[PDB]
């Protein structure tokens, strides 16, 4: 199916569609071009003065993103963290034996020369610097991500985390809805500060300042939901990554899986640059998102739900995928995992036990056995499995519009 | 069918029709003649003065298109944008390794010498120049395109995008209906500024000023709707570009497809001149429009609709195409994709599964199998597929006059 | 409507042409992958 030809004259046509912006980019294929990640910390002038600049700025108004970045770099310039063994990623070396590397041990580079108020602000603010203020600035990135009334319930947990031998209060007052601190999300340099904080403390989990993580955590695997759903599927089915892979039954789910499992990406690595591929600006279009894995996401999350996931209840229903074909596939998988137990001997003392009506479903969880069974069922889902799917979806309550939960209850519980 | 002859005397007649203006032109066949794209920026006199000239002009009145062009070139003369790898299109080189190319790195050339008010206008306007005013001038091109009450709903989203660390207000007051800023559309030079802005930031997506894009986006693939509908068909059927191609069943859809898929056009290229073929004045008659692909557009969009597209609902019904023949073709395609699932094994562990009443439709989605089936159905659409077509179109609501949605519901839901 | 032409003869001709184009669809394969499909009551039209 490479070559297509016009039959009336015997000539060749080459089908080609307008590529949806940039391809997939990939983390690895980036470090092929550059060896560093540019952190443009603009002003490097007076660190004590900056503390007051951000404090008075945040207290209702337009605090400069350039300001807070300059502050965070000054406040988090702690060269703490005793390297346990060795640290290397995508070829870039960061640590050896007993190295004492800090948090900004990737590139810094100076930028611009335009600043706002000029010099020493209000000397009002005492130290209590590193202690809570950095937590807040990083904590607003977590709050800025969302857009529903969950904000005034996640900012609530912001204020109650700046009391760890601190206890102060709050700062701004204006409701979110993307307007105030949300500007920061689209700042290449800000996001780079948050990603380097999460990465540093993912390595140094036992560090005192590792509390900065919650607020900066939402950056690890940002736009990598498909990968998360693949892990969730393994946990919920109890099968191995290999077995689950063999249960892919649609062509365009296979494609997506292959896309996600490209060999040289360090996705299974403990402490890598890979999970921060977006916020470190390594990739303009993640290979691992739901958006670029729509068939896989729907299929995986539908099965997950039939199998009694509570996550899946509220997953997004993608657009432009073959719902009918995908849904019957997910049903077979879920029906197979749900019906009939395994029960096999695991350990012995030199003494084992070997194991070996008509429309009866197969013994175990092997794809080939079930595939053969589905053929003999006229390639249509049985009454038993439809009743299984019903039982699974009914008594789900208050499911939101455009979720897989809403799709699944509506499909299977008439 | 090349030669035709008169039978009574044995002489030759050559059928030939008056060609509808110019043929198809094509982007490639343009750079065969010229190596540059002329940008005639007339006046290159005083950039600070121009800021006031456009501001007071737009505040109700006739602001000169020559003025705003002179302004935009001055304001957007930012030589920003660090080139990632390499940039080349249709033979014209623009970038290499680590080049620092700006937004007007295609031709500029000076023009005329007639200007309006003379010298320094009102020094009223501060900087806030590049920050929001260029966004507006470019944003009026988006608003100018349309002609229905959608204007006062797309100009609403104009004003709310000039607040990104800006927040001002508005400018003119007069309703659109093509009269005020609509003149600009037919300005070769203005359209060239918008197209170079969209192209620059399609490459530099991560740039700060990339917000100018929304407003200038409607230029990428202007008059290339047929290409968009071909992509949409692939997404909605889930088939490949090659498979979809084989499902063309009308002679005049084949012709159109062939026209669109001409080999040397860079249509599948990431960052090319091709999508701006109209606004950069590369083509006087797009090969890729609905107007020049009427059979394909109708066929593609009808199928798309039967398959549950929400886009297609409101697509234009072209004129002078074989509705009857086209519609029965689209029906077969949609009926084939809708009925009967695929279900095939994708991955293995050295262990595969091979797959192999009377008027029963074919197994899968192969054209030959369905074509054979349609013959045996007396070359007329079955009751089952007519009932499929009904179910598909009924309960569609408020469909506009002269759309494919209106055609389809009226054909299939009596 | 012109003058001095054979309306009767002309009109029956036009009818045949229009009737032929209106009744019965075409439906033929246009593109392939090395895999074609060859196509081949009484007063039934052609």
PDB file of C-alpha atoms in Angstrom, chain A residues 48 51-52 55 71 123-134 166 168:
ATOM      1  CA  UNK A  48      17.426  41.720  48.716  1.00  0.00           C
ATOM      2  CA  UNK A  51      12.240  40.290  47.604  1.00  0.00           C
ATOM      3  CA  UNK A  52      10.366  43.557  48.146  1.00  0.00           C
ATOM      4  CA  UNK A  55       5.983  41.132  47.569  1.00  0.00           C
ATOM      5  CA  UNK A  71      13.992  36.465  42.622  1.00  0.00           C
ATOM      6  CA  UNK A 123      12.986  47.388  52.956  1.00  0.00           C
ATOM      7  CA  UNK A 124       9.776  46.240  54.682  1.00  0.00           C
ATOM      8  CA  UNK A 125      10.287  42.491  54.186  1.00  0.00           C
ATOM      9  CA  UNK A 126      12.548  40.606  56.591  1.00  0.00           C
ATOM     10  CA  UNK A 127      14.379  37.386  55.659  1.00  0.00           C
ATOM     11  CA  UNK A 128      11.719  34.641  55.781  1.00  0.00           C
ATOM     12  CA  UNK A 129      12.871  34.479  52.182  1.00  0.00           C
ATOM     13  CA  UNK A 130      13.700  30.985  51.009  1.00  0.00           C
ATOM     14  CA  UNK A 131      11.367  29.774  53.774  1.00  0.00           C
ATOM     15  CA  UNK A 132       7.981  30.369  52.089  1.00  0.00           C
ATOM     16  CA  UNK A 133       7.984  32.960  49.284  1.00  0.00           C
ATOM     17  CA  UNK A 134       9.588  30.643  46.673  1.00  0.00           C
ATOM     18  CA  UNK A 166       6.475  29.788  59.001  1.00  0.00           C
ATOM     19  CA  UNK A 168       2.009  34.051  57.539  1.00  0.00           C
TER      20      UNK A 168
END
